[PDB]
A paper describes a structure:
To import molecules that are too large for diffusion through outer-membrane porins, bacteria employ a diverse family of membrane proteins termed TonB-dependent transporters. These transporters in the outer membrane are so named because they engage in active transport, the energy for which is provided by the TonB–ExbBD complex in the inner membrane, which spans the periplasm to interact with TBDTs. The final TBDT possessed by E. coli K12 is YncD, and the substrate of this transporter remains unknown. The homolog of YncD in Salmonella enterica ssp. enterica serovar Typhi (Salmonella Typhi) has been shown to be important for virulence in a mouse model of infection.
To gain insight into the evolutionary relationship between YncD and other TBDTs and to provide clues to the nature of the YncD substrate, we solved the crystal structure of YncD by X-ray crystallography. The diffraction from YncD crystals exhibited significant anisotropy. Diffraction data were processed and scaled anisotropically using the diffraction anisotropy server with a final maximum resolution of between 2.96 and 3.5 Å, depending on the reciprocal-lattice direction. However, this solution did not provide sufficient phasing power for model improvement. To obtain experimental phases, YncD crystals were soaked with potassium tetranitroplatinate and anomalous diffraction data were collected to 3.5 Å resolution. Phases were obtained for this data set using single-wavelength anomalous dispersion phasing in combination with molecular replacement using the FecA-derived model (MR-SAD). An initial model of YncD was built using maps from this data set and was utilized to obtain phases for the higher resolution data set by molecular replacement. The structure of YncD was then built and refined using the anisotropically truncated native data. The DALI server was utilized to search the PDB for structural homologues of YncD, revealing that the closest structural homologue to YncD is FecA, which is consistent with our sequence analysis. Despite the low sequence identity of 21% between YncD and FecA, these proteins share a backbone-atom root-mean-square deviation (r.m.s.d.) of 2.2 Å. We determined the crystal structure of YncD, demonstrating that it possesses a compact positively charged extracellular substrate-binding site that is characteristic of TBDTs that import negatively charged small-molecule substrates. Based on its compact positively charged extracellular binding site, the substrate of YncD is likely to be relatively small and negatively charged.
Numbering used by the authors: 40 to 190, 192 to 231, 233 to 372, 379 to 699
Write the structure that this text describes.
């Protein structure tokens, strides 16, 4: 796991946990270049997450990227993803792979992110963590982690974590309640190993919603429709995963990973009463009950014929079957009335793949991989009323995704690389559902997006840190956009190309006395090359969500036995919220400071810390609902907030 193969960046857990609420990924990995993450502070929705513009256009979920929590997929076959599962009080590391090689990781993999949980070791240590922040937020958690032996057959290892978090919300109708349970266990079968994962999330959050420009300027914490319709969500999910690994040959390894999980959600929307009267409308309440399961097999043969070549092959099967329903708001009233939608939508994914690393010469290697994505959608519709036809339908998609990188080592401390690949974006099941034709059935004409990505990078170990550089462009084509939309049913279309250019620069350094410095910047000019609007020429326009410029810089003094401190700074360029480029979110800069003491006397380790976020009380909006239907894009953010945390660790 070294910064050297490609444009890959790895963030450590104990540092992502250092004087932080341990709630949102945003607070931790906000500095990875090319990775745009913003915390909506709305636990009825997901983080605004994107990689080099991938998934930026997404409105309510995360799309166009790949996320794995302990090898369990967080993005579904169709590309839709979520973020509520991550327990930051028990994370080992987060690896982000951006660039063409992300295409190895599924259908809509413009960039793949992999979260893995702590392994546990000697001694059996128990931790009690607590944090309290402004606007009535507070979180606590217990983590027990240890091992039965050294690290041998029979040697077992355990890590359990539970956390509970509740907030009264900065803005009206935003209080949330979130409980996490995350466990990981391992047993050494022989010198062949095994592992189990158990994930559980339970959220009951009020969705504040968005605010229109006039509404945000007038009052920042206002949530007019929030209490009018009781906009809120409740999420519950449990995942079980199982992984086996065994070294067959002295030079050939192999592994298999399978997962089973169940998600269940309820969303009360702020949809008015008039539009729902049309018999074809789906309602104002969305109910979703999905089962997902999958199996992934990998064979890594370090056998070398032709040159020193190590290659990995494998097969992946992913399955998600959902029963989806909809309801009224009438009795808009806060509870749900007559049933107005019913379906079973299955989506499953099959595809082989393989990567190879050839050490053609010394200080020059060629990495190359391919994958054949095959995705199937079926919808069995159960709602056929006089006006709402039988919308059942079925479709499939296939594509060859290839990727490759040439790596040349100027030294062992400096390696440069050049990579390229093609990408793929299937239409979501929600996108095919309806057609502007008016005929009953799926819109079988819609085809997926094509990519065309090129990148160069230079990774240099200087001092005890690393300086990485990367430059990239992406050719999007057949972008899936909206065509018609009336009577509560949105229809989609293929129209237009796009081009997205950008650059990433990062530098990390550490010095004796643990003086640590970190910096990074990222440029992204993502423009359209074709009209993607029925009534307006949107050709030259920006891409909404992407920040033309962003940057991060932090400096920290971290002694191991006493007073520690640090301070961060984050710059976010002006980001457009429309395809037409009708609205913009301000360019804003935000500062943060923190101090604390780490008293570790023999077994007990008591860590105490305080935090000032948004030190200069800058007023801003840190999230936007891209392409909101009615123009309510803005999601304001609090000003100069604080937090304080206390952690206790006892070692056995
Ligand atoms: C290791 C197993 C890899 C191949 C797994 C293929 C299993 C997918 O099987 C599919 O299941 C769907 C419902 O679940 C059915 O609708 C399809 O008829 C069937 O092909
Ligand atoms: Ca129907």
């Amino acid at each position: 796991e070294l910064d050297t193969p490609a444009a890959v960046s790895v963030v450590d857990g104990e540092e992502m946990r250092l004087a932080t609420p341990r709630i949102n990924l945003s607070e931790s990995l906000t500095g990875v270049p090319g990775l745009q993450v913003q915390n909506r502070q709305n636990y009825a929705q997901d983080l605004q997450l994107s990689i080099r513009g991938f998934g930026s256009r997404s409105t309510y979920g995360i799309r166009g990227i790949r996320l794995y929590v302990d090898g369990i997929p967080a993005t579904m076959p169709d590309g839709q993803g979520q973020t509520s599962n991550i327990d930051l009080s028990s994370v080992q590391n987060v690896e982000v792979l951006r660039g063409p090689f992300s295409a190895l990781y599924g259908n809509a993999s413009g960039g793949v992110m992999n979260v893995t949980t702590q392994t546990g070791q000697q001694p059996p240590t128990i931790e009690a963590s607590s944090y309290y922040g402004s606007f009535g937020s507070w979180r606590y958690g217990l983590k027990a982690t240890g091992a039965t032996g050294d690290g041998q057959p029979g040697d077992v290892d355990y890590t359990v974590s539970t956390t509970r978090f509740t907030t009264h919300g900065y803005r009206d109708h935003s209080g949330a309640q979130k409980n996490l349970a995350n466990a990981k266990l391992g047993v050494r079968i022989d010198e062949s190993k095994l592992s189990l994962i158990f994930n559980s999330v339970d959220i009951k959050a009020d969705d504040p919603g968005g605010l229109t420009k006039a509404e945000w300027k007038a009052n920042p914490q206002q949530a007019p429709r929030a209490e009018q319709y009781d906009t809120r969500k409740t999420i519950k999910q449990t995942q079980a995963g199982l992984r086996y690994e065994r070294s067959l040959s002295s030079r050939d390894d192999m592994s298999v990973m399978m997962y089973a999980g169940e998600r269940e959600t309820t969303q009360y929307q702020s949809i008015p009463m008039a539009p729902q009267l049309n018999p074809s409308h789906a309602g104002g309440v969305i109910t979703l009950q999905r089962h997902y399961q999958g199996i992934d097999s990998r064979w890594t043969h370090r056998g070398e014929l032709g040159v020193p070549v190590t290659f990995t092959t494998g097969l992946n099967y992913e399955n998600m079957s959902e029963n989806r329903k909809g309801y009224n708001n009438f009795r808009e009233y806060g509870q749900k009335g007559e049933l107005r939608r019913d379906e079973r939508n299955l989506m499953w994914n099959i595809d082989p793949y393989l990567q190879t690393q050839w050490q053609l010469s010394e200080k020059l290697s060629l990495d190359a991989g391919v994958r054949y994505s095959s995705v199937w959608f079926d919808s069995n519709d159960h709602y056929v009323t006089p006006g709402n036809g039988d919308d059942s339908g079925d479709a499939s998609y296939h594509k060859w995704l290839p990727a490759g990188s040439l790596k040349y080592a100027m030294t062992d401390a400096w390696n440069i690389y050049l990579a390229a690949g093609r990408g793929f974006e299937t239409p979501t099941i929600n996108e095919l559902s309806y057609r502007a034709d008016g005929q009953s059935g799926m819109n079988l004409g819609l085809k997926p997006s094509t990519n065309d990505t090129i990148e160069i990078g230079s990774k240099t170990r200087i001092g005890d840190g690393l300086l990485s550089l990367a430059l990239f462009q992406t050719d999007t084509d057949d972008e899936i956009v909206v065509d018609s939309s009336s009577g509560g049913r949105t229809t989609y279309k293929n129209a237009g190309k796009t081009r997205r250019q950008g650059a990433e620069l990062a530098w990390d350094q550490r010095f004796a006395g643990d003086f640590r410095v970190n910096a990074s910047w990222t440029w992204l000019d993502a423009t359209y090359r074709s009209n993607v609007c029925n009534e307006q020429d949107c050709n030259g326009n920006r891409m909404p969500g992407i920040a033309r410029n962003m940057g991060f810089a932090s400096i920290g003094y971290v002694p191991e036995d006493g007073w520690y401190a640090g301070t961060e700074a984050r710059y976010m360029g002006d980001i457009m919220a429309d395809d037409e480029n009708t609205a913009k979110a301000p360019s804003y800069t935000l500062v943060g400071l923190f101090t604390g003491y780490k008293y570790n006397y023999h077994n007990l380790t008591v860590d105490l810390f305080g935090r000032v976020d948004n030190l200069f009380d800058k007023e801003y909006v840190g999230s936007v609902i891209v392409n909101e239907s009615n123009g309510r894009y803005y999601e304001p953010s609090p000003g100069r907030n604080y937090g304080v945390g206390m952690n206790i660790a006892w070692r056995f």
